[PDB]
Amino acid sequence: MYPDLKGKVVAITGAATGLGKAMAIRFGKEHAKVVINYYSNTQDPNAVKEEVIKAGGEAVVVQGDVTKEEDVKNIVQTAIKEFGTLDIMINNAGVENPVPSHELPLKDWDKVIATNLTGAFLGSREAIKYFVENDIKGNVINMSSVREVIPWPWNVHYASSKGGMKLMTKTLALEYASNGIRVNNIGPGAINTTGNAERWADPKLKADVESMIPMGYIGEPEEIAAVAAWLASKEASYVTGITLFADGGMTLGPAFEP
Amino acid sequence: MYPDLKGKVVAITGAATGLGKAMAIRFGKEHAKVVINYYSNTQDPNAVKEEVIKAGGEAVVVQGDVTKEEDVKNIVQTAIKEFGTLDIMINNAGVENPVPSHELPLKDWDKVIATNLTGAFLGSREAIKYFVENDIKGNVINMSSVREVIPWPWNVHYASSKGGMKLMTKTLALEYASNGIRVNNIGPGAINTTGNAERWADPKLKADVESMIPMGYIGEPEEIAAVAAWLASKEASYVTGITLFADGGMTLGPAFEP
Amino acid sequence: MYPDLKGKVVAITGAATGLGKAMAIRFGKEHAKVVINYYSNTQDPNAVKEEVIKAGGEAVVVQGDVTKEEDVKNIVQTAIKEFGTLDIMINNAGVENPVPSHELPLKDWDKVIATNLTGAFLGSREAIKYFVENDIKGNVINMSSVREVIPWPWNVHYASSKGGMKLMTKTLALEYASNGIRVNNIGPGAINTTGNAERWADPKLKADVESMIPMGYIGEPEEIAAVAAWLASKEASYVTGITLFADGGMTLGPAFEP
Amino acid sequence: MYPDLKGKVVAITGAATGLGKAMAIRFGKEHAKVVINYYSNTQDPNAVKEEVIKAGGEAVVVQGDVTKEEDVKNIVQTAIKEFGTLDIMINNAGVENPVPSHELPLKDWDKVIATNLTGAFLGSREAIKYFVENDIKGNVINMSSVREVIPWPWNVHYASSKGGMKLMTKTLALEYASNGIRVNNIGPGAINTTGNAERWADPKLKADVESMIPMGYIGEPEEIAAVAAWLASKEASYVTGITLFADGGMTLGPAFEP
Numbered sequence A, B, C, D: 001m002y003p004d005l006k007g008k009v010v011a012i013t014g015a016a017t018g019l020g021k022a023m024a025i026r027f028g029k030e031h032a033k034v035v036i037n038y039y040s041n042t043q044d045p046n047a048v049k050e051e052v053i054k055a056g057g058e059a060v061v062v063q064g065d066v067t068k069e070e071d072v073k074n075i076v077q078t079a080i081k082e083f084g085t086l087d088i089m090i091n092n093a094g095v096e097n098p099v100p101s102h103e104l105p106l107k108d109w110d111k112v113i114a115t116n117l118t119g120a121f122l123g124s125r126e127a128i129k130y131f132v133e134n135d136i137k138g139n140v141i142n143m144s145s146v147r148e149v150i151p152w153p154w155n156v157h158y159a160s161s162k163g164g165m166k167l168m169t170k171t172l173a174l175e176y177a178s179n180g181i182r183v184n185n186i187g188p189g190a191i192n193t194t195g196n197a198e199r200w201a202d203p204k205l206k207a208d209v210e211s212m213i214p215m216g217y218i219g220e221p222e223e224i225a226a227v228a229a230w231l232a233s234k235e236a237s238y239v240t241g242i243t244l245f246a247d248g249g250m251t252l253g254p255a256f257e258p
């Protein structure tokens, strides 16, 4: 779809599952060269690698924990070693776990902040460093959420991580705009990743989730991957510092019932 | 680029010049059927029609003043008469004129509100009516500005019109989401439309405009047309109620100078 | 409560009822000199005048329709004639009426825009002109709503008027900040004015209103009047261009149900 | 000024200097019972205690580092032990340090996040727990910044911490609204605390700071303390989940130059 993405090198964190996997595959369809970071050898990154190649791309995998600076550096170095450059960095890894806020253990708060916000900072930091050093007009996409604007009871750490990610992105976008580097957030609403489809199998829970979505359906991973491909492309040449919400209307509030 | 736009009927207000013209031409490249509304026979809508056809589309022209309800209805009827349906409505017409706010004549305020905000309401209203009557999963794009969020001294009427357009869009998006209708704003920053390129020919004024733009350049009309094509396409299937800023970073504030 | 408000001249539109009345009486408690604008003498503005006086203030009444520039000018002139100056302008008059948006008559759209947005522009324009000409470090308070940020199906004209008011206020605040003039919005949520106690008399409608309010109760007019007294006072000396939401949490979304 | 604050117990972090000190003294003027948390005894917290007392309040001091959960718990325990209850928690401690973002050490990132965001989470968590357990209609004030909305090149950790604080506050306000607990941010612009008078002593730096402020002056600490006293008081009974910016117009953008 986007001819300019052919041959671009894109690194994606948390790409063995979910939205990261879907983005990897979509960049494959665009004939990009994808670095699939994954967290654990309990996962199946090689299946993603095969799907990216089948779709029309090239791919390698690399284990790394985005809460470890050395591992983030190694993700970037993997792009350089395997494909010779880096063009697009997608900080997608994230976690969540609900607990009443007055009871939330500090170590749970810390894990969510470290993965979701600090990890995205480190990935952004490392990619931008490389881009500035090598005069690359690179692109960073940070995977946020509707929860960068909509508060989330029982998930104060998650909300804080995404609200922080918004200002992190805006600051990096402003700081590095003169270098021709673009930095943007995607804000998904409720998406039918495997894990979410399973937890929302219960018809009552499913209906509750859908009640929050004006469009009336839970989105598919490909509908988020579409956004990432567009933002990374030169079609979005004049777009930086934004959050592009792809949420079925969730940021408007719950579905309207007359 | 977007195969699903082939054969879609798109009506664009204020399309004899500027961003409306650029959007018309881009939808031509996507093989759409374009209704080019224009304000005055002092303009050259037929040149746009020819460019849309050359680009790969079909096109007709229709005169109409978006501050006249009958004329807005006639724009929609022109789509139905000429092409048999309407799929995408783009409310692009606008005006501006700077005056210190405490001195702004009411008739100037009224003209800007009527064109920029009421006109977009009427166009949105009429398109959505048609879509609901005919079970069309249609799309409305309202042309806003960075001035839906950034205040604009000497242009209180313009700012108010765009701030209002934001809530107009969000409300229609929420109200009609269950009908499969998407409604979004585009928020351009400073763009090199012919009129702006002329007024910004003065090197000092040009530099002042550029100083407000983190990316350091004034955008081209095609960079806005790219956004409209994407939003109207099924790539943006899960996107409604947003404002997609395409502004070189202007909503981040002025360019960063260390 | 605020010693600096004693003897300040405050003009309030729509002050014979509802929030405007409550604000008039509160400024009376602060020993201000209040210009009570009213729409019709069938509203009993003289009863408000008497309540302002009993509360500790001075007051006069003046009829005027904020959709007529001459009447807005006459409100400001009344302050000058009766009390010798103007210090605070509160643009409070407003209307609403729900209709499905694709069916909303232009007449209705126009009435809401004219009252709610253009009327506030004219009152702001006129007060600021006086303040600038006379070196008054004046204050303008525009009565907005949570609907300057929360969309409102069936009320697209109302939402547009308040979204516009946000950018009107921000623009005036920026334009006139160097003159020492402050301009701010108040954003009430659901308030138990007489008109809304009627609107929400039905127990099921009331319950539904309350369900949208995290604090769980519909506010009282005095809770809004408190905000206006503070913003007008020197306690808020460093506050301009804001919207102060007083909404029981409505902008957070509906009440949280675990 | 606010009669309902007499005898209320307010704990304030970072209260030996700057805005925290100013808030302590202002609550003293309101005849509150103030718990002055301080970081080091080299800051002379007992001088603040004496100023609170002279102003009309009661006060105790307690050392604690808000990056240690046990110290945060001990702040809350100090209120209970010394004064018998807690009514208002003000999470004010903060740090900053500018570094180009691609060069920012993780250690520095971590310190800013831990102090500014995690520290405010822990103080909020602990106060809210107490309030819920004891049926107190308590209040939390988190000291944010204009940088919860305005990006800040070279200060990505600071901006992230405040952007996160916004969503932390909104989430807690929503989660606990039904308990009658209010949670709000204050968003100062540039304030003439001792540390910033030092930072901005240079005339050219000072002028540049002022150029970003529509009102044209750097605020004084008492102008922020005024906001905290109001938000903590029953005047703000219907106010929760907001950010009250007190910034001379900074969120509007830089001062307007025609």
Ligand SMILES: NC(=O)c1ccc[n+]([C@@H]2O[C@H](COP(=O)([O-])OP(=O)(O)OC[C@H]3O[C@@H](n4cnc5c(N)ncnc54)[C@H](O)[C@@H]3O)[C@@H](O)[C@H]2O)c1
Residues within 6 Å of the ligand: A013, A014, A015, A016, A017, A018, A019, A020, A038, A039, A040, A064, A065, A066, A067, A092, A093, A094, A095, A115, A143, A144, A145, A146, A187, A188, A189, A190, A191, A192, A193, A195, A196
């Ligand atoms: N799916 C949704 O509905 C939804 C909605 C909004 C936002 N998001 C965001 O999308 C992103 C992807 O999540 P998802 O929904 O695909 O869920 P997911 O759990 O499938 O994906 C998250 C991935 O991150 C990886 N990961 C976790 N911690 C990591 C670490 N320390 N280092 C490296 N990898 C790590 C996980 O192993 C997993 O592969 C997240 O940022 C999430 O917040 C998802």
Ligand SMILES: NC(=O)c1ccc[n+]([C@@H]2O[C@H](COP(=O)([O-])OP(=O)(O)OC[C@H]3O[C@@H](n4cnc5c(N)ncnc54)[C@H](O)[C@@H]3O)[C@@H](O)[C@H]2O)c1
Residues within 6 Å of the ligand: B013, B014, B015, B016, B017, B018, B019, B020, B038, B039, B040, B064, B065, B066, B067, B092, B093, B094, B095, B115, B143, B144, B145, B146, B187, B188, B189, B190, B191, B192, B193, B195, B196
């Ligand atoms: N060019 C920019 O830098 C820029 C930036 C932000 C937003 N915008 C927005 O883009 C839109 C298009 O403007 P543009 O920059 O191309 O300027 P333009 O003046 O070339 O285009 C505006 C068009 O609207 C038409 N028009 C005006 N009043 C009308 C009426 N009553 N009925 C019908 N048509 C009418 C004009 O004749 C003209 O063709 C506007 O909404 C404007 O606010 C432009």
Ligand SMILES: NC(=O)c1ccc[n+]([C@@H]2O[C@H](COP(=O)([O-])OP(=O)(O)OC[C@H]3O[C@@H](n4cnc5c(N)ncnc54)[C@H](O)[C@@H]3O)[C@@H](O)[C@H]2O)c1
Residues within 6 Å of the ligand: C013, C014, C015, C016, C017, C018, C019, C020, C038, C039, C040, C064, C065, C066, C067, C092, C093, C094, C095, C115, C143, C144, C145, C146, C187, C188, C189, C190, C191, C192, C193, C194, C195, C196
């Ligand atoms: N009460 C609420 O819950 C609520 C919520 C959000 C915002 N508001 C806003 O508060 C303001 C006051 O409304 P209210 O709730 O007290 O309702 P209200 O209807 O009781 O008061 C509105 C007043 O405005 C006057 N008015 C209307 N059109 C006018 C005109 N053309 N010229 C002069 N006066 C005119 C009416 O006569 C009336 O006295 C409005 O701006 C409204 O949008 C109210």
Ligand SMILES: NC(=O)c1ccc[n+]([C@@H]2O[C@H](COP(=O)([O-])OP(=O)(O)OC[C@H]3O[C@@H](n4cnc5c(N)ncnc54)[C@H](O)[C@@H]3O)[C@@H](O)[C@H]2O)c1
Residues within 6 Å of the ligand: D013, D014, D015, D016, D017, D018, D019, D020, D038, D039, D040, D064, D065, D066, D067, D092, D093, D094, D095, D115, D143, D144, D145, D146, D187, D188, D189, D190, D191, D192, D193, D194, D195, D196
């Ligand atoms: N002064 C301004 O212009 C300004 C502007 C916006 C926001 N703020 C915010 O106001 C708050 C107060 O800062 P300030 O300007 O008064 O600066 P300050 O440096 O004078 O005060 C910060 C205080 O926090 C204390 N502190 C720092 N780390 C701590 C820790 N780990 N544990 C306990 N105490 C600790 C310091 O010792 C100091 O007393 C901060 O949150 C800051 O971000 C200040």
